[PDB]
Amino acid sequence: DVYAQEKQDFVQHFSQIVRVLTEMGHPEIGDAIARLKEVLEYNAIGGKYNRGLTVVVAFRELVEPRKQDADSLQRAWTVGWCVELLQAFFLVADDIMDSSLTRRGQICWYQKPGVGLDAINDANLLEACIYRLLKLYCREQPYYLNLIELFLQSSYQTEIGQTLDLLTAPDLVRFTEKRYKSIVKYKTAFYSFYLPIAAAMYMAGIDGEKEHANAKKILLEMGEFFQIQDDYLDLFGDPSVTGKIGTDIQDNKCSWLVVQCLQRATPEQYQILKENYGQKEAEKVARVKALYEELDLPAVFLQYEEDSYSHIMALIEQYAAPLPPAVFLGLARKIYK
Amino acid sequence: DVYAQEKQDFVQHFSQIVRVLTEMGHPEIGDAIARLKEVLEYNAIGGKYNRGLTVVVAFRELVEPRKQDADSLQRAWTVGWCVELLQAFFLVADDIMDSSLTRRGQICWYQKPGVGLDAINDANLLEACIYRLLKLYCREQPYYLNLIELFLQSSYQTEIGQTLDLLTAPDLVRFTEKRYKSIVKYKTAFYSFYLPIAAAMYMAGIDGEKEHANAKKILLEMGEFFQIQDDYLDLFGDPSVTGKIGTDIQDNKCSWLVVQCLQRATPEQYQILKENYGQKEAEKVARVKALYEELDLPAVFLQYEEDSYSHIMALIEQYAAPLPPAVFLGLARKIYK
Numbered sequence: 001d002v003y004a005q006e007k008q009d010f011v012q013h014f015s016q017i018v019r020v021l022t023e024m025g026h027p028e029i030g031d032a033i034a035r036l037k038e039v040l041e042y043n044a045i046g047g048k049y050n051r052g053l054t055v056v057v058a059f060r061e062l063v064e065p066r067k068q069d070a071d072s073l074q075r076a077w078t079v080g081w082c083v084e085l086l087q088a089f090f091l092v093a094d095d096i097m098d099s100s101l102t103r104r105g106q107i108c109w110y111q112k113p114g115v116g117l118d119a120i121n122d123a124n125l126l127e128a129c130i131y132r133l134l135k136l137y138c139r140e141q142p143y144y145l146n147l148i149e150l151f152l153q154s155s156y157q158t159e160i161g162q163t164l165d166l167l168t169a170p171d172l173v174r175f176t177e178k179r180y181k182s183i184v185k186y187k188t189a190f191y192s193f194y195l196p197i198a199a200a201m202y203m204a205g206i207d208g209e210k211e212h213a214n215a216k217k218i219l220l221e222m223g224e225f226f227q228i229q230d231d232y233l234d235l236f237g238d239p240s241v242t243g244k245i246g247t248d249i250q251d252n253k254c255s256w257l258v259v260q261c262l263q264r265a266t267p268e269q270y271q272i273l274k275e276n277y278g279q280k281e282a283e284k285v286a287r288v289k290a291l292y293e294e295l296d297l298p299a300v301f302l303q304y305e306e307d308s309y310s311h312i313m314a315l316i317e318q319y320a321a322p323l324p325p326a327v328f329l330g331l332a333r334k335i336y337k
Numbered sequence: 338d339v340y341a342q343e344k345q346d347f348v349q350h351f352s353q354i355v356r357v358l359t360e361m362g363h364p365e366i367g368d369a370i371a372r373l374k375e376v377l378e379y380n381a382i383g384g385k386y387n388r389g390l391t392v393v394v395a396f397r398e399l400v401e402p403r404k405q406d407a408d409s410l411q412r413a414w415t416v417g418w419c420v421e422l423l424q425a426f427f428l429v430a431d432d433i434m435d436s437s438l439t440r441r442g443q444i445c446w447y448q449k450p451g452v453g454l455d456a457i458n459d460a461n462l463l464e465a466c467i468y469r470l471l472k473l474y475c476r477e478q479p480y481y482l483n484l485i486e487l488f489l490q491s492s493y494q495t496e497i498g499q500t501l502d503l504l505t506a507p508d509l510v511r512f513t514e515k516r517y518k519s520i521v522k523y524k525t526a527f528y529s530f531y532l533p534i535a536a537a538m539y540m541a542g543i544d545g546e547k548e549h550a551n552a553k554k555i556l557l558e559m560g561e562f563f564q565i566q567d568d569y570l571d572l573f574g575d576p577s578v579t580g581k582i583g584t585d586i587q588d589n590k591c592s593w594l595v596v597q598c599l600q601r602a603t604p605e606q607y608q609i610l611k612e613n614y615g616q617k618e619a620e621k622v623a624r625v626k627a628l629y630e631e632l633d634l635p636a637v638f639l640q641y642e643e644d645s646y647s648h649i650m651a652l653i654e655q656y657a658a659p660l661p662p663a664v665f666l667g668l669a670r671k672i673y674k
């Protein structure tokens with residue numbers, strides 16, 4: 001596995017990431033820097049690192065091996081960790097706003113004794129660390145500004161996505177397909193799928209607008225597919241297999257499932273849905289599920305997967321050049337659950 | 338007044354700022370953009386605009402009038418508003434973290450019905466808008482990257498400052514002068530005093546490290562002075578004159594007053610302080626005040642002002658060149674209350 005190959009080195013680099021972000025020529029910010037260390041250690045560690053690793057895998061596939069000096073790699077690892085820091089920023093903040101209890105098999109940072117709403121500042125520090133790292137490791141590089149702009153834009157797009165999600169889910173009237181597709185695109189797909197390849201692209205000197213537009217077209221369609229899958233597996237997944245015990249229905253999400261359900265429902269079924277969506281009790285969660293089954297949404301999903309395979313293989317056929325197909329295909333394999 | 342002269346045009350530009358940040362080639366983010374308009378309108382408007390205006394005043398004092406085309410000015414106004422957007426980001430967030438009720442004579446944004454902790458995202462959008470504006474108005478300019486780095490660094494320094502404030506005020510043991518001075522420097526002085534002049538400097542082609550270090554030396558010392566004044570006036574100000582009804586003691590702040598009080602107190606006075614600092618009731622707030630009076634902290638302040646005048650005039654004498662002294666002196670006059 002091309003990701004398993006890169007992994008150990010990527011994770012070991014985290015140690016260096018931290019050292020450099022904390023190491024006291026100015027003594028009396030010491031205490032704040034110590035808090036910064038704790039924030040990084042708790043929140044940047046424990047994921048699958050798919051997004052950060054994608055930077056490293058893509059880098060290796062896109063830069064001729066004659067230009068993979070010890071130093072270029074340090075940079076690749078660093079930029080990968082920059083993506084992981086972006087993720088951490090979003091998730092610390094998202095947990096506060098959703099009033100979540102747990103994340104990545106542990107108490108959400110803001111819920112830890114004596115953190116609370118101070119986590120808002122902590123989240124912002126994580127974001128800040130992106131640009132500090134980019135400066136320290138890539139200031140002299142020709143792609144420096146490209147990377148700054150890409151990260152800032154990725155942040156902007158994600159935040160806009162979050163705004164749309166927040167407005168959409170404060171009433172099922174609002175849960176349309178055009179709306180669902182739009183949330184997924186801004187809120188997850190840009191920073192999860194486009195950003196990591198795009199970074200690698202810029203680090204490899206592939207900076208053209210067309211090349212970027214082409215990679216983007218593939219990657220946003222991949223990101224939509226993987227989010228829709230995520231929505232399906234939330235309910236009909238086997239949690240021992242996926243790792244997620246679904247709570248989308250209780251949590252009242254604009255999920256792909258509900259959108260499809262809404263499109264198909266008779267007026268009376270709308271009512272059963274209006275009646276049971278977003279409740280604690282299993283009794284009710286089971287009536288929503290049983291409705292999705294009644295409307296045969298798994299078959300609808302299966303069909304969506306089949307269609308979606310053809311479309312995405314075709315997209316890569318057409319739009320991958322002059323990147324290696326394996327960049328796209330390697331990422332698909334890694335994310336698919 | 339050089340600020341009153343620039344003001345009407347600066348504030349009128351806000352309209353343009355908004356238009357450009359909202360104007361629907363992508364239709365289905367419409368609703369999110371509408372929310373963005375509301376966030377800007379509520380949170381970026383109603384201050385004195387000292388920091389944003391400083392960019393515009395400094396620009397005019399630093400660029401020869403032959404290079405003050407309609408376009409250079411648009412840019413100056415825009416960059417000024419970028420400082421105002423940074424301020425707004427910090428304050429929306431700070432209000433959430435402090436659990437404040439009011440700001441700028443109105444309900445804090447997060448306290449408005451149906452905003453709540455969604456304000457966290459809103460705060461981040463305000464930050465994002467800085468870099469969108471910088472791109473739209475200054476991408477082709479030679480100082481573009483300088484401005485990106487300055488804003489990102491200003492954010493980093495402020496956040497670090499906030500971390501230090503949060504750690505320092507979660508116990509009077511912690512309220513030392515080295516610590517107080519350090520909070521003020523990172524949390525307020527860099528972005529309130531250095532950032533706006535520095536931006537103008539870069540827009541004028543003054544990009545040298547020495548020149549920046551020199552401006553910085555003056556401006557951080559100015560920022561310390563104005564924060565210490567702010568602390569004094571919180572208690573001994575006349576609120577009808579200043580506009581602030583002080584609540585530093587109740588709110589348990591690391592204020593200059595308490596630091597000085599701590600340095601002077603006998604063991605028994607420490608106890609009266611330990612006993613009354615951070616309470617609701619006036620009875621107790623009056624015993625803290627009466628102690629500061631007992632220890633004659635106003636005289637200590639007066640002396641601090643006198644010393645501080647000589648020092649800062651001397652700093653400008655020595656370090657202002659090749660900037661016009663009036664940049665520094667104009668800002669002092671404007672902020673002094």
Ligand SMILES: O=P(O)(O)C(Nc1ncnc2sc(-c3ccc(C4CC4)cc3)cc12)P(=O)(O)O
Nearest residue numbers: 120121124426427428430431495496499524525
């Ligand atoms: O209550 P305030 O606003 O008068 C005052 N707060 C501030 N005054 C001046 N500048 C700043 S910058 C600042 C801050 C707050 C939150 C953040 C979070 C985004 C990370 C960053 C900076 C708070 C603050 P304080 O009495 O808590 O010291």
Ligand SMILES: O=P(O)(O)C(Nc1ncnc2sc(-c3ccc(C4CC4)cc3)cc12)P(=O)(O)O
Nearest residue numbers: 222225302305306308309310312313332336337
């Ligand atoms: O994962 P499987 O083999 O158990 C099964 N998967 C599929 N079954 C039938 N047709 C298809 S097409 C498909 C697929 C996989 C990857 C992609 C990636 C390019 C995005 C697109 C479609 C998975 C799949 P399901 O239990 O998720 O329904």
Ligand SMILES: O=P(O)(O)C(Nc1ncnc2sc(-c3ccc(C4CC4)cc3)cc12)P(=O)(O)O
Nearest residue numbers: 302305306309329330331332333334335336337
């Ligand atoms: O297990 P199978 O083959 O009988 C069948 N699976 C499939 N049938 C038809 N086409 C496909 S494509 C497919 C697949 C799964 C994972 C991937 C990962 C590289 C992304 C790609 C394609 C599974 C599958 P299903 O009855 O479990 O849905």
Ligand SMILES: O=P(O)(O)C(Nc1ncnc2sc(-c3ccc(C4CC4)cc3)cc12)P(=O)(O)O
Nearest residue numbers: 089090091093094158159162187188457458461
């Ligand atoms: O609960 P989760 O984390 O599984 C999920 N949230 C997310 N999943 C994937 N990507 C993202 S990016 C995102 C977000 C949250 C807060 C912000 C605030 C800083 C502005 C920005 C982005 C939330 C999120 P959802 O079930 O609320 O959709």
Ligand SMILES: O=P(O)(O)C(Nc1ncnc2sc(-c3ccc(C4CC4)cc3)cc12)P(=O)(O)O
Nearest residue numbers: 559562639642643645646647649650669673674
């Ligand atoms: O403002 P005033 O005239 O009523 C009086 N101000 C002063 N009185 C005596 N000495 C001084 S030195 C001083 C000053 C003003 C501006 C500065 C700016 C360069 C930072 C530094 C020191 C104000 C002042 P106070 O009521 O604040 O004590």
Ligand SMILES: O=P(O)(O)C(Nc1ncnc2sc(-c3ccc(C4CC4)cc3)cc12)P(=O)(O)O
Nearest residue numbers: 639642643646666667668669670671672673674
């Ligand atoms: O009103 P005053 O002159 O009798 C006396 N004020 C001063 N005495 C001696 N030196 C100075 S310098 C000073 C001042 C006030 C505002 C400024 C603003 C430009 C920043 C500068 C200097 C007021 C002052 P105070 O008894 O009110 O403290």
